[PDB]
Amino acid sequence: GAMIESSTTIQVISAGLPRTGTKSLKNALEIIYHKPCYHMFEIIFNKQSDIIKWQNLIHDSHMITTPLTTKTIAIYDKLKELLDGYIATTDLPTCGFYKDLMNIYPNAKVLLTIRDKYDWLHSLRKVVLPKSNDPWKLKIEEGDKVLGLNSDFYKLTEDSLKFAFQKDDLNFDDDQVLLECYDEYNRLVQETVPSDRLLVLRLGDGWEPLCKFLNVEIPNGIDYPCVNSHHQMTQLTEQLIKYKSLDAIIHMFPDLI
Numbered sequence: 001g002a003m004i005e006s007s008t009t010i011q012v013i014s015a016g017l018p019r020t021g022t023k024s025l026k027n028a029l030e031i032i033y034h035k036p037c038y039h040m041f042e043i044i045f046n047k048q049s050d051i052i053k054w055q056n057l058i059h060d061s062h063m064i065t066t067p068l069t070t071k072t073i074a075i076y077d078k079l080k081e082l083l084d085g086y087i088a089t090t091d092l093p094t095c096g097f098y099k100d101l102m103n104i105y106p107n108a109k110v111l112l113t114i115r116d117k118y119d120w121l122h123s124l125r126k127v128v129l130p131k132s133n134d135p136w137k138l139k140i141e142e143g144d145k146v147l148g149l150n151s152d153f154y155k156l157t158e159d160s161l162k163f164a165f166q167k168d169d170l171n172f173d174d175d176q177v178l179l180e181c182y183d184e185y186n187r188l189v190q191e192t193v194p195s196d197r198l199l200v201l202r203l204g205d206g207w208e209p210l211c212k213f214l215n216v217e218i219p220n221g222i223d224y225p226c227v228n229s230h231h232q233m234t235q236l237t238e239q240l241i242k243y244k245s246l247d248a249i250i251h252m253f254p255d256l257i
């Protein structure tokens with residue numbers, strides 16, 4: 001196809017929860033658009049200084065009104081500022097703001113990444129939210145310290161998930177609670193977003209439906225990304241602990257990071 005000059009603004013809002021292929025999707029959008037896509041990894045590796053800013057936004061987000069009041073404009077401006085220079089959003093903490101992002105970026109299209117709820121839960125427990133008594137939790141915390149992630153990071157991740165599920169009293173150790181929130185969250189996205197503006201991507205769907213939805217060619221000779229498996233994250237955590245730095249090992253994780 002012909003090459004056209006794309007605007008550096010949010011063009012794709014992905015409402016999918018972590019462990020549904022968000023990092024692969026982030027990489028896929030960057031291959032298409034040649035500009036950055038937001039993700040929790042963007043905070044971890046490039047934008048740790050914005051942790052407090054995401055926290056402040058969540059703190060004020062209860063004051064959002066779905067016309068537009070004056071308090072919502074202030075919140076919307078901080079969201080737009082946080083995303084300046086990016087062409088898409090995926091993952092926490094952005095995903096729970098999908099409805100507000102649709103208002104801020106009226107010409108952006110919306111994606112929902114989904115998968116089997118039990119596969120999701122098991123992936124979540126291995127990587128990002130182990131049960132409190134799971135010994136692997138202590139390894140995650142040790143690797144996090146190597147990356148410079150402290151208590152404010154843990155607050156932001158939890159608070160952003162509570163915001164996405166619209167539930168402050170969240171028993172993170174309760175599998176049935178989490179599964180119920182996952183199903184209700186995905187149902188609400190599909191009920192909320194007009195179907196002309198939504199594409200639901202199940203894990204493994206690949207380039208095709210995404211590229212058709214976005215009116216772009218499939219990137220020639222590039223396989224759709226497959227990164228961030230729970231096995232690969234376990235290796236990343238163990239390698240961070242072993243070497244005590246990211247830069248000692250980053251060349252071993254060329255696409256994940």
Ligand SMILES: Nc1ncnc2c1ncn2[C@@H]1O[C@H](COP(=O)(O)O)[C@@H](OP(=O)(O)O)[C@H]1O
Binds near residue numbers: 018019203
């Ligand atoms: N192209 C692809 N095909 C199949 N699964 C994929 C994929 N890209 C990512 N995944 C899976 O999506 C999960 C990562 O999601 P996220 O990046 O949102 O955390 C991992 O699940 P598992 O932990 O079950 O392996 C990973 O294996």
Ligand SMILES: CCN(CC)CCNc1ccc(CO)c2sc3ccccc3c(=O)c12
Binds near residue numbers: 040128140147157161
């Ligand atoms: C050594 C491993 N370290 C660094 C890589 C894990 C860093 N942690 C996270 C990474 C990515 C994501 C979402 O992509 C989440 S989401 C979430 C949601 C609720 C609670 C915690 C988390 C969470 O801790 C996390």
